[PDB]
């Protein structure tokens, strides 16, 4: 049964990845075909840029503002900055905004989504001047709603670009993220690429390639059928028409009789999906964000994301009937995402309980081969040799995403720490206990048996491969070869500041 299980797991994990690669290539081909027909100096869409932030890094916030102002798009209405502030510690961002754009920081005493008159004209009069609002701290959804209302009060605005306060945009990011809206009339949202620039630590270095894979391959596969499940927070274009009709249900959201304060962009893309509309993904709109370098902060972030995913997967599954064919792909992806977690958990439990050295070695070898193939494709697509670091993302997944998923599932059905990391510590202790039990139960040496020789040689080779990859990473870190070209210049400017 071990051979059947391992072969089934390998075919299940691969194959789908190959199909996703093919679909992403087709989506990129279609995007290139659309772009090649674009006229030069095309600015037919009038957009408004909305930025929402809460106590951001003043250096990175200034970099984001300057990257927005240094864009080469010829049709920009104005910049709408919303700060979840109104307090003394939050004027440090208003000062940055005044340094970059102007002294138009309006400070209303009310949150627009909690007032009787939610029209944007209640807190702003002139629609031509770039605006900054210092709103009382409620959340990201409230700041986004205020930005939506300030953008929709201009009758000439057709679309909106949503970026984070730590997102550094390329010069053509806005154009490349708003162009696909004008190709198909049924397209209402576009998702750009998000790239990790602080690839200096090992965790961030692995998360950068996880981001690359998850955006490019997966979102391209989704965009071939125009059913992208989540629009990236750091960069996303929305139609004002869909915004004006999904902003209220998305802001007055209650799940199991309580307010929802996570998955702000996942729920927005969901609301777009459940109305039968289409979302695409463009690899040519690129914005740079960063990743957590600490494991525990990453675990909290992944717990939040897993909570959002658990909340939204049922609505995504239930809204698949109004897409017809190519909505079958959405349901298949949802079922695959559901089944993958249980497949990994069951495989780990079965292999651990039945302490067979052949099964363990075969499983680790198959997993290593699969991630080697995936990293080879990633290196081919990115034209970068550092994409082979992705072979070590299995450790990050096993030790961070499974605890986060289990914690989110348990939450959705001293105590503050026990509600965040108790399950993670239990999982780590269980993995250590399983390893110790296997080592103790398989404590013998027999070089006259070719099966024992095979198992020992395989496990030793896997350990040597992991050590070689780690040594290569350390060498690259010492010489700063792992540094993203944006990271080097960011460090250089921050030194002179």
């Amino acid at each position, epitope marked *: 049964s071990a051979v059947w299980g391992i072969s089934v797991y390998g075919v299940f994990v691969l194959g789908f990845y190959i199909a996703q690669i093919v679909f992403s290539e087709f989506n990129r081909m279609r995007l290139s075909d659309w772009i090649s027909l674009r006229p030069d100096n095309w600015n037919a869409t009038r957009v408004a840029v909305i930025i929402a932030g809460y106590r951001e890094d003043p250096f990175m916030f200034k970099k984001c503002l300057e990257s927005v102002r240094d864009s080469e798009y010829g049709n920009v209405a104005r910049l709408i900055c919303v700060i979840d502030g109104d307090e003394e510690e939050d004027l440090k961002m208003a000062e940055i905004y005044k340094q970059v754009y102007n002294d138009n920081v309006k400070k209303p005493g009310v949150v627009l989504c909690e007032s009787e008159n939610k029209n944007g004209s209640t807190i702003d009069s002139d629609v031509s001047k770039n605006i900054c609002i210092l709103q009382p701290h409620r959340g990201k959804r409230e700041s986004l709603y205020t930005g939506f209302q300030l953008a929709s009060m201009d009758p000439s605005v057709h679309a909106v670009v949503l970026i984070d306060s730590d997102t550094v945009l390329e010069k053509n990011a806005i154009l490349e993220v708003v162009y696909p809206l004008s190709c198909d009339p049924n397209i209402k949202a576009v998702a750009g690429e998000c790239k990790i620039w602080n690839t200096d630590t090992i965790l961030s270095m692995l998360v950068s390639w996880r981001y690359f894979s998850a955006f490019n391959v997966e979102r391209g596969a989704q965009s071939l059928w125009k059913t992208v499940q989540c629009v990236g927070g750091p960069l996303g274009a929305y139609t004002i028409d869909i915004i004006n009709e999904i902003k209220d249900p998305w802001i007055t959201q209650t799940f199991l009789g309580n307010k929802c304060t996570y998955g702000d962009n996942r729920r927005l893309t969901n609301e777009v999906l459940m109305r039968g509309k289409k979302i695409v993904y463009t690899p040519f709109a690129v914005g740079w964000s960063d990743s957590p370098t600490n494991v525990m902060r990453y675990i909290v972030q992944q717990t939040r994301w897993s909570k959002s995913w658990c909340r939204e997967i049922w609505y995504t599954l239930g809204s698949a009937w109004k897409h017809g064919f190519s909505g079958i792909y959405l349901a298949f992806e949802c079922m695959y995402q559901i089944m993958y977690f249980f497949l990994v958990m069951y495989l780990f439990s079965y292999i651990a309980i039945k302490a067979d*050295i*052949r099964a363990q070695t075969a499983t680790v070898l198959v997993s290593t081969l699969v991630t080697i193939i995936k990293s080879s494709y990633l290196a081919l697509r990115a034209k970068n040799l550092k994409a082979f670091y992705f072979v070590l993302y299995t450790y990050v997944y096993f030790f961070c995403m499974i605890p986060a998923r289990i914690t989110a599932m348990f939450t959705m059905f001293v105590w503050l720490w026990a509600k965040q990391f108790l399950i993670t510590y239990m999982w780590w202790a269980g993995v250590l206990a399983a390893g110790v039990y296997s080592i103790v*139960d*398989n*404590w*013998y*040496f*027999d*070089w*006259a*048996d*070719i*099966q*024992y020789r095979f198992a020992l040689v395989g496990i030793c080779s896997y350990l040597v491969f992991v050590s070689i990859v780690l040594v290569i990473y350390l060498i690259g870190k010492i010489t700063t070869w792992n540094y993203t070209p944006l990271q080097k210049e960011l460090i250089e400017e921050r030194y002179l500041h």
Partner: nanobody, 124 residues
């Protein structure tokens, strides 16, 4: 550290069947390679059969297809079933167990435990 107890032997005449067994008392019998030797007339302990901890079976060339070895870790017993016996297949049988060893598994000195032997006779 396993104590080996023999159980077998009988008045086999010709071409009969006799399943010999060896019971091992210990703690980690699953992590043990068990072999069978015979001290035939002429004091030379030769290899008869063997089974490793991963159920890999080794047989001598003379008795390649005649004998079948099996193990039961639940019962902690190794069994050797004999088919189509020969007059040369008369001897006292010993079961040997080892835990750590190299490529040498046929030599008598490659096993660290030796319980006892049972007499098996063939007539004509």
């Amino acid at each position: 550290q396993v104590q080996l107890v023999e159980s077998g032997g009988g008045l086999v005449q010709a071409g009969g069947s006799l399943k010999v067994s060896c019971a091992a008392s210990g703690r980690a019998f699953k992590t043990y390679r068990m072999a069978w030797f015979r001290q035939a007339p002429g004091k030379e302990r030769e290899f008869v059969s063997g089974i490793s901890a991963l159920e890999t079976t080794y047989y001598a060339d003379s008795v390649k297809g005649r004998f079948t070895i099996s193990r039961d870790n639940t019962k902690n017993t190794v069994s050797l079933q004999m088919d189509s016996l020969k007059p040369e297949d008369t001897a006292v049988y010993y079961c040997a167990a080892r835990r750590y060893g190299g490529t040498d598994y046929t030599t008598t000195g490659s096993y660290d435990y030796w319980g006892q032997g049972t007499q098996v006779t063939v007539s004509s």
